[PDB]
Design a protein around this ligand. Structure first.
Ligand code: HEM
Ligand code: HEM
Lengths: 199, 199
């Protein structure tokens, strides 16, 4: 998780946009000295990642959460769009490939969430609200949710350290940049949209 | 990283297909007790993940590799296609959302690769070969590579434990499955193709 100056966020607001737009995160902790990772929806409470709170849930029968007891520092990785950059795109004889991407890394202490229902219900609102149509939990769904609670574990993470990666070829020259962006405009509109938000 | 019986790989070959098809991985280790993660290309040497070797490189100025010295067990996460599953897709009144995805998790001891040039040159071949056109390193590119070596660190991982996730709604009934697959066929062909390789 090293970040060059050139591939940094322009406004610290950029990290939170990425977080809110890509909630299917990776929750990582040191179970017994070895990294263990769960894929889970995690949402952001607050305006900023640093000094904000993340909220997530996983399967209770997923034993990963039982090792949150010690409350070790965890890493939550949010992954935005990404894409391979082939030298055939550059069309230059001395060249080397790379991979373009955006990511937000949040490190902090995890604790177990009191109100699992709040967490899951807020996770619903977070994901369904930009979708059209927005799924709004029916009362019977809220009752269904109530019945599913014994099978979920929710958690919180107080973000102690945030770190953002916006590796969008912006160190390239004007000519090689154009080929990269136009090549991604075709096949990877999320990535190409991001190369514009970096200018 | 818990896997229900229902969302498992049908043939252990399925893990390696996913690995080879999604080499932009996440390399995770316990630096000082806290997870640290780097996004890097990692390729598979061998027919199987378990008992195979992974090979990767990162930036030398990325200090993450300096903590591979102790050679702790690392986790490499390979992420295949994924997608949110909205209850509006099910069209059923008592419902709850989820996220469908495929991933391979490889845990083993990392060591520093002697032949960084082999690693990067094999990483090139791995990525460019299915692309049309395939970028084949020009001699001057191979010379360029030679000049870039002081700026890269390559590594190896002996996979001690493999674990695969193929969460593709296959526990759904026939009617709800159809809506999910057809909804992904439209917007997420990689995911929908995978729901067929699970049958
Ligand atoms: C709003 C968007 C939601 C998403 C994207 C989502 C996604 C997921 C995912 C990916 C898992 C697997 C975690 C693991 O592997 O351990 C999971 C577990 C679980 N969550 Fe959710 N969930 C959402 C909302 C809810 C709601 C509203 C409830 C209501 C109680 C709920 C209850 C559960 C249950 C019972 C499980 C365990 C069963 C299973 O593995 O599916 N979730 N959820
Ligand atoms: C074949 C596909 C390749 C991909 C997808 C790729 C991708 C990447 C990525 C994502 C990084 C950043 C790692 C970090 O953040 O620490 C990196 C670092 C680096 N790799 Fe590669 N690489 C490839 C081939 C090569 C080759 C053939 C060389 C030849 C020596 C090379 C040399 C380097 C160098 C010098 C750096 C540091 C400069 C930088 O940050 O870009 N790579 N590579």
């Amino acid at each position: 998780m090293h970040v060059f100056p050139r591939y940094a966020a322009a406004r610290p607001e950029q990290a939170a946009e990425l977080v809110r737009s890509n909630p299917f995160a990776l929750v990582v902790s040191a179970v017994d000295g070895v990294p263990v990772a769960t894929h889970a929806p995690v949402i952001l409470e607050g305006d900023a990642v640093e000094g904000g709170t993340l909220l997530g849930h996983m399967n209770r029968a997923n034993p990963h959460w039982r090792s949150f007891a010690s409350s070790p520092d965890v890493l939550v990785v949010f992954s935005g769009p990404h894409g391979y950059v082939s030298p055939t795109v550059y069309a230059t004889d001395p060249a080397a490939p790379t991979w373009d991407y955006a990511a937000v890394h949040a490190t902090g202490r995890v604790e177990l969430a009191e109100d699992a229902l709040d967490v899951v219900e807020r996770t619903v609102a977070a994901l369904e609200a930009p979708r059209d149509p927005a799924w709004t939990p029916t009362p019977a769904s809220r009752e269904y949710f109530r019945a599913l609670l014994p099978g979920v574990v929710a958690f919180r993470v107080r973000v102690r350290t945030e770190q953002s990666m916006f590796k969008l070829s912006q160190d390239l020259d004007a000519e090689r940049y154009a080929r990269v962006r136009e090549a991604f405009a075709a096949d990877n509109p999320g990535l190409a949209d991001l190369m514009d938000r970096s200018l």
